[PDB]
Symmetry: C4
Subunit: 242 residues, 4 copies
Amino acid sequence: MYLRITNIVESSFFTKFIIYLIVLNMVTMMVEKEGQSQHMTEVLYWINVVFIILFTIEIILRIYVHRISFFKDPWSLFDFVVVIISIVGMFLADLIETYPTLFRVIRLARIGRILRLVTAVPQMRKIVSALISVIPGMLSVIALMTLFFYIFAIMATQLFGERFPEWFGTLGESFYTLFQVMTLESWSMGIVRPLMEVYPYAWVFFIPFIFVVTFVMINLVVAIIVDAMAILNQKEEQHIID
Amino acid sequence: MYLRITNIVESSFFTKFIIYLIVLNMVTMMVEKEGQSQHMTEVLYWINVVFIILFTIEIILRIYVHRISFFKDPWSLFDFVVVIISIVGMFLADLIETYPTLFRVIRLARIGRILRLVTAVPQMRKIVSALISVIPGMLSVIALMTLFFYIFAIMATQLFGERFPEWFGTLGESFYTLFQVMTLESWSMGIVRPLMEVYPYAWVFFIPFIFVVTFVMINLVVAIIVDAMAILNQKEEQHIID
Amino acid sequence: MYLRITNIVESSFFTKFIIYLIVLNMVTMMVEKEGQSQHMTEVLYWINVVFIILFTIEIILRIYVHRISFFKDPWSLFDFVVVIISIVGMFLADLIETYFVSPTLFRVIRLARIGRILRLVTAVPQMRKIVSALISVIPGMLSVIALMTLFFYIFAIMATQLFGERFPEWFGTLGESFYTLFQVMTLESWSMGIVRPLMEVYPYAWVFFIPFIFVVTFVMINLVVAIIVDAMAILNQKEEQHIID
Amino acid sequence: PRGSHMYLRITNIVESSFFTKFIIYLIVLNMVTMMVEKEGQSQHMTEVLYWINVVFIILFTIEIILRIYVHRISFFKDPWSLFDFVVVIISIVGMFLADLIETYFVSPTLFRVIRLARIGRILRLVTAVPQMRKIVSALISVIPGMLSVIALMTLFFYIFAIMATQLFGERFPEWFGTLGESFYTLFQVMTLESWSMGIVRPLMEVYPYAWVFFIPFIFVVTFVMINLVVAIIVDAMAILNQKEEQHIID
Ligand SMILES: CCN1CC(n2nccc2-c2cc(C(F)(F)F)ccc2Oc2ccc(S(=O)(=O)Nc3ncns3)cc2C#N)C1
Ligand SMILES: CCN1CC(n2nccc2-c2cc(C(F)(F)F)ccc2Oc2ccc(S(=O)(=O)Nc3ncns3)cc2C#N)C1
Ligand SMILES: CCN1CC(n2nccc2-c2cc(C(F)(F)F)ccc2Oc2ccc(S(=O)(=O)Nc3ncns3)cc2C#N)C1
Ligand SMILES: CCN1CC(n2nccc2-c2cc(C(F)(F)F)ccc2Oc2ccc(S(=O)(=O)Nc3ncns3)cc2C#N)C1
């Protein structure tokens, strides 16, 4: 009896069917506009509840097989946190709408159901993991970039923030404009040149910020290149020996 | 008329002369403007018909020398699709002109004869396939980047698709702005800063979107290097034997 | 004598405690608002006074325990130059605040407070490592940086000549032309903002800016390739050493 | 008699440290005068600056005539020495040709173009000072390999440029009117400067499926570009793997 239910759960079909189910939930979410139709909203929402119930049947079948060993594997554990959030959230969203800004934000909880398309599917799972593994080597370079931003963010508010509060009022505004100056999005035409009307020697803060930022950025990417080449030459080196 | 032609087609004269015919068909396609002059349109359209005729003459000679073995080659197969699409397009466009916006959309079939420059030039052939061989390795990273775009796209409509339909109303409408924000083109001054007039904490969607997409970007570029470094080191590894 | 002090200053706890103060002084420098109110501005000013005192006390112990070693160490003198800057600044900014003179002189002079905070790139370890491993790169690309500046001159001497007459706001001065050519280099509004309105007056302006972008991008790409090949030289020239045995 | 004493004494002056370091000084000194010309600026300041430059023009002519008698046809075989002479003949022609257009006040627009000859004098700074000529030659040695990717990139621009003019040429002649116009706008779109907020979005009011031409263009160009930058790395790693190779042979 149970060996047939476990045969079906720990199956080549079952995985492919759950992948398919998530893919179709994504399609029922992809067909959402601003229009929309008071009817369409009632239509789409129910097809999602058709999914939420099937995805709770999905984890109930999968918790039946693993009993308490389900909590051990974080994959099984993630699928459970996604399922509880879909449920806790769909009822929270229905509740809010019945009695504003919160409704559209709270309605986000549905993303976990389709986010499982990086998790539940292998090949993708592999690329997500192999990419995440880069971050710790960068964590030092990342930390200095954050640390450098604080010095400049304290300076910007101090220096310009009086006449330019729209960009450098609080350290919050200051951090944002600097990141934008860093991404080089309208740094001059939009931010530095109008600053040079009030303060002609404003570039003395931004031109070096651009240089310092770009330098740290260049070294970060180069470190990933060289870290990939360090492990590549390591296997190449021992092969040569004999 | 099969004994002498078999050797003239597989000659330096025939391949160089046919490459010359393409260059001359590019120049005639270039000397087109918005102007234009109806006489200039009639003259240029006729110069093209001569080349469309000449390139048909070319493929007939190429078919009846290689007999059926012509169709084995995917390159000769392409050069054949080029002439049929050119001939079909020639009359398809003319039928519409004689009997407005569809006429422009159809007329780009003329590019087929000009696209042959990469495939026909035996060196341009090489640089193209050297770039093609890169893509299989990238396919993993792309698929993940595509899916991340979908999640961020479904979110953008749900969050800001209502009040800002010009950039986020539809899924595809949202997909476009996310690509514009990815290329970092006017992401802050033109999109995120005006979005924060309505939604003050909108930056907590776009800055985390920037990082997610840029990290994946860096890694793809880094991957193209490592993939090509396995080429330098492998021809060096076999050389280090003697 | 003084061995109990020699154990406090230059230890593990004391080393860590100074980081804690540097970090706590950053958080009070993070309370900078657009407002700000006569109360809050003076409140913040006084909190910093306390920190400046603590940091002067901090360098007093440091130079006493390592009497001759202070001058030999470069990082030990940085924390000293910062102390003498923080002290000079404190009263120099106060002098301009008391004697009501240009907020422009005050806002610029108050920028000495930053020294107390940029100590985090020094004082806390691994941060000193990263910043030093980054600074070590700067010479192994200094010729490319030098070539770039020279390339910028030649191009700025040209831009002021050609476009400077009808476009003074962007190219009227060599200082104006050094700015615009830098903006064009970062590709920010290069065409729409500068090269396109220039073509309204001088339609063959692109013949200068398209090659400028090219000449200036090639030098840039190679500067980054130089950082890679020099990093991959330390790896490659040690790889050979092991292979030899 | 010999007779050859002076032509072996003058080579000790021309092929020395002082001369070389002094000629590098003269170019730097000629740069600062060219640097101080701006917005406008009286005919006094303009004549003052013009005369300082004439002095500099003859100063480099004596320098090349010194090298002319010493190295002779051995200077001709050197490209850096040949170019130095080309600069001199340009800084002289230019000096007169610009003055001619100033005397007979016909074409004030052609004047600023011809007057650009003066840049040859300070253009020589990268080739004169060593280590700068080193890197210049090192960068110049990167472009030959790179050449085939560039040739492909150019071709991709020709096919995309004949396409842009064909489609959005009638309603938007401002950007894609002529073939040459399309080349510029597609380069702007490639460099990503206001590609959407400025060009692809307004184009979508008229032709709403216009992005189907630009998104692939932005992909294709960026794909060829990345591979070009990656090629520079592989062109550079050809040096490292070969020097290491012979060392391991023994
Ligand atoms: C005035 C309120 N009316 C709207 C709601 N309604 N209309 C159709 C279906 C539902 C609905 C029913 C249930 C039930 F009948 F089950 F009680 C639970 C939730 C329901 O509503 C939603 C269903 C799905 C989604 S979703 O597709 O966006 N998924 C989400 N996931 C996480 N947060 S929202 C959102 C809502 C809402 N509001 C009743
Ligand atoms: C105003 C109406 N005129 C269109 C036609 N005309 N005028 C000059 C040449 C031709 C023409 C002749 C033939 C025939 F000779 F067969 F009768 C076939 C097609 C013909 O028309 C074209 C010729 C070339 C091109 S092209 O240069 O754009 N090349 C193309 N390649 C692929 N698709 S279009 C387009 C058209 C059209 N329409 C009458
Ligand atoms: C209305 C005039 N008030 C300015 C001054 N004041 N208010 C509060 C504290 C102080 C102050 C006290 C001392 C004394 F302790 F002597 F009483 C010395 C200097 C003092 O002034 C400053 C102290 C710290 C900072 S800071 O926090 O910006 N840190 C800086 N570091 C370097 N340059 S500024 C700025 C000022 C000023 N002006 C009187
Ligand atoms: C009506 C003519 N006015 C210009 C002339 N003037 N004033 C000062 C120096 C000269 C001058 C003298 C000579 C002579 F001495 F021969 F008589 C030759 C050319 C001279 O003029 C120039 C000198 C230098 C430059 S430059 O600094 O731009 N250098 C250049 N280099 C290359 N092309 S221009 C431009 C001009 C002009 N016109 C008076």
